[PDB]
Design an enzyme around this catalytic site. Structure first.
Site, short mmCIF file in Angstrom:
data_model
loop_
_atom_site.label_atom_id
_atom_site.label_comp_id
_atom_site.label_asym_id
_atom_site.label_seq_id
_atom_site.Cartn_x
_atom_site.Cartn_y
_atom_site.Cartn_z
N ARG A 83 0.81 -1.17 -0.12
CA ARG A 83 -0.08 -0.11 0.04
C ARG A 83 0.87 1.27 0.00
NH1 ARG A 83 -1.49 2.73 4.64
NH2 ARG A 83 -0.47 1.25 5.77
N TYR A 222 -2.20 -4.67 -5.99
CA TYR A 222 -1.87 -5.17 -4.62
C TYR A 222 -2.54 -4.67 -3.54
CZ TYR A 222 1.31 -7.19 -1.06
OH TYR A 222 1.81 -8.15 -0.10
N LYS A 231 -9.44 -1.64 3.03
CA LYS A 231 -9.19 -0.18 3.92
C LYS A 231 -10.10 1.06 3.25
CE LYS A 231 -5.79 -2.06 6.34
NZ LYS A 231 -5.71 -2.10 7.76
N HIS A 251 -10.60 1.15 13.06
CA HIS A 251 -9.58 0.28 12.79
C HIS A 251 -9.27 -0.71 14.03
CE1 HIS A 251 -4.92 -0.32 11.75
NE2 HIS A 251 -5.55 -1.53 11.44
N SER A 273 -1.01 -1.25 12.83
CA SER A 273 -0.11 -2.44 12.23
C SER A 273 1.04 -2.66 13.05
CB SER A 273 0.03 -1.89 10.70
OG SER A 273 1.12 -2.96 10.04
N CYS A 275 1.32 -3.98 15.93
CA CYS A 275 1.43 -3.87 17.53
C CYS A 275 0.39 -4.49 17.93
CB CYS A 275 0.87 -2.37 17.80
SG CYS A 275 1.90 -1.20 16.75
N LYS A 277 -2.92 -7.44 18.55
CA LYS A 277 -3.96 -7.14 17.43
C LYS A 277 -4.48 -8.51 16.67
CE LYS A 277 -5.21 -4.28 13.57
NZ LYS A 277 -3.70 -3.55 13.30
N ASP A 298 -9.18 -6.59 12.43
CA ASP A 298 -8.63 -5.28 11.49
C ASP A 298 -9.81 -4.22 11.56
OD1 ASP A 298 -6.67 -3.78 10.20
OD2 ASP A 298 -7.72 -4.37 8.20
N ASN A 389 6.41 -8.17 3.67
CA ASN A 389 5.39 -7.59 3.77
C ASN A 389 4.13 -8.77 3.24
OD1 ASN A 389 3.42 -5.21 4.66
ND2 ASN A 389 3.01 -5.68 2.33
N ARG A 391 1.64 -12.02 2.28
CA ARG A 391 0.12 -12.07 2.90
C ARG A 391 -0.34 -13.49 2.55
NH1 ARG A 391 -1.84 -7.04 5.28
NH2 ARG A 391 -0.31 -5.59 4.57
N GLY A 509 -0.59 -14.65 25.23
CA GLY A 509 -1.62 -15.23 26.05
C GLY A 509 -1.57 -14.69 27.39
N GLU A 510 -0.58 -14.28 28.15
CA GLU A 510 -0.49 -13.77 29.36
C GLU A 510 -1.28 -12.37 29.33
OE1 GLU A 510 1.73 -16.98 30.69
OE2 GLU A 510 0.08 -15.74 31.32
N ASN A 511 -1.72 -11.69 28.05
CA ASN A 511 -2.34 -10.45 28.31
C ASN A 511 -3.77 -10.95 28.63
OD1 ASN A 511 -0.50 -8.76 27.43
ND2 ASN A 511 -1.04 -9.10 25.13
N1 LIG Z 1 6.23 -8.39 23.08
C1 LIG Z 1 5.00 -8.72 22.40
N2 LIG Z 1 4.97 -8.70 21.16
C2 LIG Z 1 3.73 -8.78 20.48
C3 LIG Z 1 2.70 -9.24 21.43
N3 LIG Z 1 1.58 -9.19 20.64
C4 LIG Z 1 1.96 -9.05 19.13
N4 LIG Z 1 3.36 -9.03 19.13
C5 LIG Z 1 4.38 -8.96 18.06
O1 LIG Z 1 3.94 -7.93 17.33
C6 LIG Z 1 3.98 -8.49 16.12
C7 LIG Z 1 2.79 -8.13 15.35
O2 LIG Z 1 1.56 -8.84 16.11
P1 LIG Z 1 0.22 -8.99 14.97
O3 LIG Z 1 -0.82 -9.36 16.19
O4 LIG Z 1 0.50 -9.68 13.91
O5 LIG Z 1 -0.13 -7.52 14.67
P2 LIG Z 1 -1.20 -6.52 13.83
O6 LIG Z 1 -0.68 -6.10 12.54
O7 LIG Z 1 -1.68 -5.36 14.70
O8 LIG Z 1 -2.36 -7.61 13.66
C8 LIG Z 1 4.56 -9.86 15.90
O9 LIG Z 1 5.81 -10.11 15.70
C9 LIG Z 1 4.13 -10.43 17.50
O10 LIG Z 1 4.86 -11.39 17.74
C10 LIG Z 1 2.45 -9.25 22.67
O11 LIG Z 1 1.48 -9.17 23.53
N5 LIG Z 1 4.05 -8.88 23.20
#
Ligand SMILES: Nc1nc2c(ncn2[C@@H]2O[C@H](COP(=O)(O)OP(=O)(O)O)[C@@H](O)[C@H]2O)c(=O)[nH]1
Length: 599
Positions: A83, A222, A231, A251, A273, A275, A277, A298, A389, A391, A509-511
């Protein structure tokens, strides 16, 4: 040889129940001059026909069905791999209505440029008319669209990513409104000329006309440039609609959490993106009695229901995920979704037995064919096997922890809205807003280190209108709502680091333990410290039972250091200046209040 309207093949047999659509198609076809026009119906027989044609063109190779049934690998032209922000425009009548987070051009000028590009752009190609519905078909008045495209690749992915075809076409009835979405790869062909696997153009535009709810795309085949639901519609056009019609297009992932008492809670979370999710949307809790199911990872569309609660629906039909980083240990439910097949992979690597691989995935294959068609060797080749990047494009319905409410047009009641980004310092693991307007401020000033970029509600490259007016819209919906029914707002940070560089909180998972605190706060079953930035739990407010972690690291993760927050202030202040004249007073209010609470 320019062909008129009713002599272009496929136009004589076009569906005529909707004359607006038919007139539009004919006008477009007259302009772009395709060899023929095809209205897609979204059937399985159509899907296979298009896939076969994609295989023949070299665009697709069929993956080993023993490992992924009905699955394909496509490699793009290296110049067309993502994008492109700088080529993306919001062409509202007045520049101020696009505002400082958007690229603007006078719409008359844009129409002059793009209409010129579009002339004869589809010569030697089939023009597809792709009707689609955003959200469950069950709704009485759903948001509908039609994408015209010369890309068969686009048609197949749109079938996965949206409710595409006959049903959506019928929903449009004889005069129903729909978003006009126009797309071309910009590579006309002469008669008898050999196509390439992935056609595209050096000239690229991705343009939105908010007033008329139109999307014009050119030059790229793409992702978000070409799958116009993903989007362009879901966020850019939809957010403008939501502005005028009293709702929210966001989002956000949508998560279903079920407690040990078997009560269900639904959360929306806006992370930018990477972070993610995707990981939170597919959480598997690490504490007994807690379960999680997903509605999406998303996009979320949210409207107030009769009872004054905020209800969310996932307008998409498929997942369009980043392959590298995804693996069986981090995200097994994502992997299981993919394992069921019916997936299009773009720009990943091919194994010797026709499986697929990407960086971070298990297996350590010794030889691959990489994303550019070249040989790759384990512990030797210095380039990435898959594009960074790359998919996967996969049906939502194959997700093993899909919530049963996933296809319900009524949506799910939202108890909590989360905002988070990548911050190595400053922001604590979790904070609860003081009230709605403070939650809007928190959303509005969301920072992520990807030096801190401000990415309001994870919407920085996706707003369909002025960012200040968007904050005001969020403010307005909370002022006119029953405060008792509003979701609570929370601010999370998974990425705080100690001085030695390690993550203070293990996450994934600990989240679930953080989510447990959030649920308890909503039920008033947990406490926390009143801090200048909001309510922040102490270590003793969290269920850390069975978690092998130094309690001191957790305390550090939760700390609210006033000096750090005082450094944060001028950064926030400069962002609010950037938001410009349309910055709501309500947001500035929360800035002053925070500054005062800090001393
Ligand atoms: N340290 C840490 N990294 C995380 C966590 N959740 C996701 N990440 C990392 O951040 C990256 C993106 O996660 P992803 O869920 O695919 O993100 P999205 O693009 O917002 O959907 C990956 O490399 C994960 O391993 C987390 O709870 N702790």
């Amino acid at each position: 040889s320019h062909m008129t309207s009713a002599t272009i093949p496929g136009l004589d047999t076009a569906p005529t129940n909707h004359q607006g659509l038919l007139s539009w198609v004919e006008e477009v076809a007259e302009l772009t001059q395709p060899d023929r026009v095809v209205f897609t119906d979204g059937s399985e027989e159509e899907f296979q026909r298009l896939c076969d044609q994609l295989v023949e063109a070299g665009t697709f190779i069929r993956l080993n069905p023993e490992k992924h049934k009905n699955s394909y690998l496509a490699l793009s032209d290296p110049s067309d791999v993502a994008r492109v922000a700088s080529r993306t425009y919001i062409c509202s009548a007045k520049e101020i209505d696009a505002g400082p987070t958007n690229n603007w051009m006078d719409p008359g000028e844009m129409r002059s440029i793009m209409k010129d590009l579009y002339r004869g752009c589809m010569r030697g190609r089939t023009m597809y008319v792709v009707p689609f519905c955003m959200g469950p078909l069950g709704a009485e008045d759903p948001k509908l669209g039609v994408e015209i495209t010369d890309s068969e690749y686009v048609v197949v992915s749109m079938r996965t990513m949206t409710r595409m075809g006959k049903a959506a076409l019928e929903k449009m009835g004889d005069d129903g409104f729909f978003v006009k979405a126009l797309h071309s790869v910009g590579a006309p062909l002469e008669p008898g000329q050999k196509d390439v696997a992935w056609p595209c153009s050096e000239t690229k535009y991705i343009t939105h006309f908010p007033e008329t709810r139109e999307i014009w795309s050119y030059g790229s085949g793409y992702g978000g440039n070409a799958l116009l639901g993903k989007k362009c519609y879901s966020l850019r056009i939809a957010s403008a609609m939501a502005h005028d019609e009293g709702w929210l297009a966001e989002h956000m992932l949508i998560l279903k959490l079920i407690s040990p008492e078997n009560k269900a809670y639904y959360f929306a979370a806006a992370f930018p993106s990477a972070c993610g999710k995707t990981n939170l949307a597919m959480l598997q809790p690490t504490i007994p009695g807690w379960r999680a199911e997903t509605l999406g990872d998303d996009i979320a569309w949210m409207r107030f229901g009769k009872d004054g609660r905020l209800y969310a629906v996932n307008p998409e039909f498929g997942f369009f995920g980043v392959a590298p980083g995804t693996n069986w240990k981090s995200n097994p439910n994502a992997m299981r979704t993919i394992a069921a097949g019916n997936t299009v992979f773009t720009n990943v690597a091919l194994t010797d037995d026709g499986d697929v691989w990407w960086e971070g995935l298990e297996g350590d294959p010794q030889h691959l064919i990489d994303w550019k068609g070249n040989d790759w060797y384990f512990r030797e080749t210095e380039t990435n096997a898959a594009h960074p990047n790359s998919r996967y494009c996969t049906p939502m319905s194959q997700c093993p922890i899909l919530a049963p409410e996933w296809d319900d047009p009524q949506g799910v009641p939202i108890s909590g809205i989360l905002f988070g980004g990548r911050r190595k310092t400053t922001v604590p693991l979790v904070t609860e807003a003081r009230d709605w307007q403070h939650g809007v401020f928190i959303g509005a000033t969301l920072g992520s280190e990807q030096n801190v970029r401000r990415d309001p509600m994870a919407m920085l490259p996706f707003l369909g209108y002025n960012v200040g007016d968007y904050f005001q819209h969020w403010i307005n919906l909370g002022k006119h709502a029953d405060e008792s029914k509003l979701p609570k707002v929370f601010f999370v940070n998974w990425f705080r680091r100690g001085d030695d560089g390690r993550f203070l909180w293990p996450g994934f998972g600990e989240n679930s333990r953080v989510l447990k605190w959030i649920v308890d706060r909503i039920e008033h079953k947990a406490g926390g410290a009143t801090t200048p930035i909001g309510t922040v739990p102490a270590v003793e407010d969290l269920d850390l039972d069975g978690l092998d972690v130094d309690a001191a690291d957790v305390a550090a993760a939760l700390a609210v250091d006033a000096d750090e927050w005082r450094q944060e202030l001028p950064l926030i202040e400069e962002w609010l200046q950037f938001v410009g004249e349309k910055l709501p007073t309500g947001v500035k209010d929360e800035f002053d209040a925070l500054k005062e609470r800090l001393g």
